[PDB]
């Protein structure tokens, strides 16, 4: 029953499920088009794009297919513990990443 989020190869949100709206505080329309780093606190925020670049040029996963409990940040600035699972998919020869987010609250 997790929240689902999809981003492109550059970290830009492409889909934001209903549950993601309730969890993070942004509407689907607002989230789409924004970098996924708006959902996290520092230092991950400023480093997330590097996380993605690192994976695309090495193909060495740290969270994909592994999973981790991390800290997410709501629209009102408050942080919470969440479990994160990530998958990779191709469409039109382009990479997209699918994320499942479980609020551990």
* Residue 85 interacting entry, from Na ion, ligand HEM, Cl ion, none, C-beta within 5 to 8 Å by type: Cl ion
**Alpha-carbon span 104 to 93, nearest angstrom:** 35
Residues 3-42 that bind Na ion (CB under 5 A): 32-33
Using CB under 6 A, which of 8, 21, 30, 44 touches ligand HEM? Answer: 44
Near Cl ion by CB under 5 A, which window of 2-10, 22-30, 41-49, 65-73?
65-73
Number of residues engaging Cl ion in binding (CB under 5 A): 2
Using CB under 5 A, which of 61, 67, 81, 87 touches Cl ion? Answer: 67
Nearest Cα to 6, choosing from 89, 92, 103, 93?
89
- Answer yes or no: is 48 a known binding residue: yes
Is residue 39 part of the contact set for ligand HEM (CB under 6 A)? yes
Decide: 97 and 6 in contact? Cβ < 8 Å: yes
- For residue 37, how far is the Cα from the chain centroid? 7
User: Rounded to 10 degrees, what is the CA torsion of 18, 82, 32, 7?
Assistant: -120
């Amino acid at each position: 029953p997790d929240a689902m989020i999809v981003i492109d190869g550059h970290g830009i949100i492409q889909l934001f499920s209903t549950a993601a709206e309730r969890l993070f505080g942004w509407s689907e329309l607002e989230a789409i088009g924004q970098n996924v780093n708006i959902l996290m606190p520092e230092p991950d925020r400023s480093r997330h794009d590097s996380y993605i670049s690192r994976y695309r040029t090495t193909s060495d996963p740290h969270i994909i297919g592994i999973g981790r409990i991390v800290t997410g940040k709501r629209r009102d600035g408050t942080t919470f513990p969440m479990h994160l699972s990530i998958g990779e998919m191709q469409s039109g020869g382009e990479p997209y990443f699918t994320g499942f987010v479980r609020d551990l609250t």
